[PDB]
């Protein structure tokens, strides 16, 4: 099959087996410079050239067998970058391996990287750098076959200023002073498990660590270490449940890195070193499902990988499925259903936003000429989860379906697969229930836009109180506002308080007087919890409360998690009173934003 997001030679021509990265981080120039030595295996007879993906890279030279070789960079193809064709000195036979050493330098504008000044950090004394390769940004760090259909091991040596620490998506393999510059340190890394290149990750900063489990360190700037160790204390218990559900954890270490607030995602499942947003630091462990999700990716996504980005639901859907089972084991089956029903609500929201006929609402998408960052949404997570949860109910329950999940991980470990490979194995494992499987509307579930053709069965126990309070507020008239009181929330957990807000937000706007009363009785303005605060500010802005304008703008800019930043900017642009402020704020902050976040907020606000 064809990876339409890559310009490199496909896996049927050649395959990268290993990467040996030797680089230096220069904060003054905002460049990563070094050599990427690719061990490439030919898959064809008489192979004389190959093509690699690049994006805003400066190539100095290409060396094979100790000699410089001819290379050519093609015309840039927008978000795909520029193809780099390399002329091999000797024709290769099938299975023959060669080492190709590429000397490169990144651009300060690399879409994979964010360079932070000391002022943008917690400590204010040192700069900071972090990468984010998923989906197709690894090509903006180094020349590679930037496709999840190719898996490679890697070794790396990273030179950094001596007062800083480097970490990667690999096992730490020591540190020494740089033998070429005593003002620097070299940090060494080893990733012995084969991975797709989007899982390559680097962070350089004034980082400290604290042990929180037998195979877990939490890493962050000094200011966040204590809070992070507490917030993520359930990590080991989640790893033990995940091992029981998916089989052995093969990665050795499971560390966590708490990034600065501009980190654009909730979490990134980088092997050995999960990256997390500091917006999870709620103080009560209530946002720990993000850790359960990243842990689950150690099986679904990192071991069993989607062959192309069109089949991304395979990564997300199975991970959400496993994550909800972890939380189900820790908190109970009623909680798993509450989270599952919440997920259906988030799917309804995504489908309503794009429109029910939009191609991005399809489970399997055609990404030909589509930037994956633009296509990204809750759809592959929630529609993917909904399908598996529906199959679980159709096939005899969670115990039976978890047996299939474990066999699926074992079958496809270290491989890259498509929706057809998954479906085929599903039919094979469930051969005694093929009559049941033939009742599924596969064409609709996998290839049709909008809401799924069937809604699963959900226990309502924990959801009932959220729906009842939301309906009281929506149906309330002016003379009913007096009946609301802080006592309404006494029996609600933080998760139920969030679901109350999500239910009400789906019916927004509410009258301005109702929103004013909600602040008067519930004091939602005082809640620090990022998920609750975000839904509350969206509710205020959509209900046209001018007092919420500075609070929404502050939240949209003081952190950069796209889940929060994008809808807050969009809501502020849609409110007449704040439109000009939203545009101006984006324009002032654009140059100091994460490049992917800056691009997407620009598109949402229609500001070039
Ligand atoms: O833990 C996590 O999952 C976080 C990890 C960071 N990350 C970034 C990201 C960006 C672009 C992507 O591309 C695609 N989007 C779609 C949407 C629909 C169908 C196919 C595709 S392929 C995929 C992932 C995701 C959030
Ligand atoms: Yb070692
Ligand atoms: Yb009344
Ligand atoms: Zn994920």
Author numbering: 3 to 610
Sentences from the paper on this structure:
LTA4H catalyzes the final and rate limiting step in the biosynthesis of pro-inflammatory LTB4, that is, the vinylogous hydrolysis of the epoxide, LTA4. LTA4 binds to a deep L-shaped hydrophobic channel which forms one of two lobes of the catalytic site of the enzyme. The second lobe of the catalytic site of LTA4H is a more open and hydrophilic pocket, and forms the aminopeptidase activity of the enzyme. While less is known about the physiological relevance of the aminopeptidase activity of LTA4H, Snelgrove and co-workers suggested that it can degrade the tripeptide PGP which has been reported to be a collagen-derived matrikine and neutrophil chemoattractant.
As the unbiased approach did not yield a compound sparing the aminopeptidase activity, we decided to test whether we could obtain a potent aminopeptidase-sparing inhibitor by truncating an optimized LTA4H inhibitor, JNJ-2699313518, with the hypothesis that the potency against the epoxide hydrolase activity was not strictly coupled to potency against the aminopeptidase activity. Overlaying the structure of LTA4H bound JNJ-26993135 (compound 11) to that of PGP bound in the active site showed that simultaneous binding of the two ligands would not be possible due to steric effects. However, we hypothesized that by removing the part of the compound which interacts with the Zn2+, we would be able to have simultaneous binding of the PGP and the truncated compound to LTA4H. Removing the carboxylic acid group of JNJ-26993135 led to a compound that was still a potent epoxide hydrolase inhibitor (compound 12), but also did not spare the aminopeptidase activity. Replacement of the piperidine-4 carboxylic acid by only a carboxylic acid moiety, led to a compound inactive in both assays (compound 13). Since most reported LTA4H inhibitors extend from the hydrophobic pocket into the aminopeptidase binding site, they do not exhibit any epoxide hydrolase specificity.
